[PDB]
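Honest question from a wet-lab person: if I give you the sequences of every part of a complex, can you actually get the arrangement of the whole thing, not just the pieces? Trying it with mine:
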Amino acid sequence: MLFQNVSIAGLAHIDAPHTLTSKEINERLQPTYDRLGIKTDVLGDVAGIHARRLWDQDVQASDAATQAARKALIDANIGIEKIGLLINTSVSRDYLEPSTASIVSGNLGVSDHCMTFDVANAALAFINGMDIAARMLERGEIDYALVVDGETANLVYEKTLERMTSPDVTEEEFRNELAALTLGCGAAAMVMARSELVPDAPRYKGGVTRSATEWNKLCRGNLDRMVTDTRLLLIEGIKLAQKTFVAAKQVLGWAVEELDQFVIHQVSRPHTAAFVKSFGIDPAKVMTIFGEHGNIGPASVPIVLSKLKELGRLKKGDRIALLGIGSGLNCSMAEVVW
Amino acid sequence: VPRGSHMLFQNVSIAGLAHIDAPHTLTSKEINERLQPTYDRLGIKTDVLGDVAGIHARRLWDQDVQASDAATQAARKALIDANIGIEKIGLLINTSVSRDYLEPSTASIVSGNLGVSDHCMTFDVANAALAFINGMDIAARMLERGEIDYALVVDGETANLVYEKTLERMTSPDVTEEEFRNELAALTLGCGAAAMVMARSELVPDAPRYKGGVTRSATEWNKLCRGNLDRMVTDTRLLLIEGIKLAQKTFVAAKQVLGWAVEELDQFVIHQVSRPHTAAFVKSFGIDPAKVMTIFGEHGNIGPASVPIVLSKLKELGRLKKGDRIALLGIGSGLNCSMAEVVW
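Yes, you can. This is the full assembly:
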């Protein structure tokens, strides 16, 4: 019932080049903090984000995804002519029409057989994109797929910061919009393939999803604004994950001790610590880049997986859980055997 | 001689289908009256909406209707058509161009409105006017595998804002001829919504079967039509030329995998961008225009909802019979072209 012949041929990530530290942001927001009587460092100390990266001026989501895709093609040692499907999974998008995938695909020079489209599902979309690609691979529709994701937070920072340094900004608004300053830029891409083409490549098994769509108002993001009930998002997200983990026990045969790495989408340091404690996950098996890069939306999971690969942390046979709670609320859990 | 499936979908059916027509009519005559001083300044003497593009009216929602609201209205009607409750739905995919937010998916909001169960998988697909077909295929792969029993594919489009802002821009005393021509196709869009319930065929033995189909792309043309919530710029001339070239490629694939010959299909449900573009398409492939229902004249171009709205109207009008082979065809910005078959 799980995927039998679906592999990961290549994986890459791109770190955005400009550092914006929380110290620097705080220097700018300090007058407003004081007026609200905030007092704590809600970014560095509470959320646990000390920096994030921003792109150069005028870098679009498609530019970032293209850079990651070129690097993933090199990692897979294949040319773009082999790609039969390119799915863009980012929250950021160039336009409503056409798909950002078509723009990345044009940049890369895909063939006329290549099917492309975007999937949107907040932070879980890269996993959805992997599942969608796996189903096509398993059925023999394509041999290789690219799943790409470029996130830009430049505008949300610029706008939120303006809309927070106006003296006349208010306090409900303030806490509602704080989570926007935990976002970061970055990009990732993955080449997936039919297993008989790539012996020795990691195997993607697929996984489980549960949802709690009654909570779809808890985090609403646009190009220039994100509004988020952080507290409620944490509790309801972890309750949802409890259902999903029960599901994963049954269909994936999961037991926490037997998994070798947990690659977890991160919203905040406390959210992550709550999640880890809830499931009794060894925190050593959880790589985190949130402190320096913040929340890179649906690129977070593959950027961390790529970093684990580049560091030499993954060995043959390792059982790797990809986990995340996405705005929706949705929770997806999936396995890769390295 | 043993033959394979050609990777077409097996045992996937259409259990229910519905559309919503938006309530307010905006005529091209009214639009022309507003644009008249600009037409006169630019020397435009023909009715480029009514006579050239072939659109006499389009429907609009109220200002406060979101994509998710339109989609939910369609989904409720589709569930009734399938005679199933929302608790049977294991997948819901929203395919619209219009979006409530970047995050979360419009799908999650439609799903919350409808009250889907905690087993329901949801997400959005975006692919300009072909996304509903992408949605059907994604759902089909899951239903064929037997992972779910029923899926909803939903799409609500709202063009209110693009009308309001485009008309403001085009009535500016300073609008240039170039920007006027660039924005003109935005005045051919319309609001509306569609939804479809798909199911494993074992559950609905006498329902229409969805076979899937083929796609080809020409992504070097991804700049030809670009749209955001308040503006759409379109190179209509090149969309015509490159779109037809791409459809010819896709038609070759459809012959090979679907075994299509135009004379053997009973209906063609074609995504429409304009009357002359449709006429060129039909003429290019030798399609019988009597088998092509059009709503463009009175509803305009409803984006990815166009194909399912027209299929739903065909069903409602009593134009579809058991055994009819229905071609779903379209060229969408990208450029992409997809061709798929439903056997009624």
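Two things worth pointing out. The two ends of chain B are 27 Å apart (CA to CA). Chain B is about 35% helix and 25% strand.
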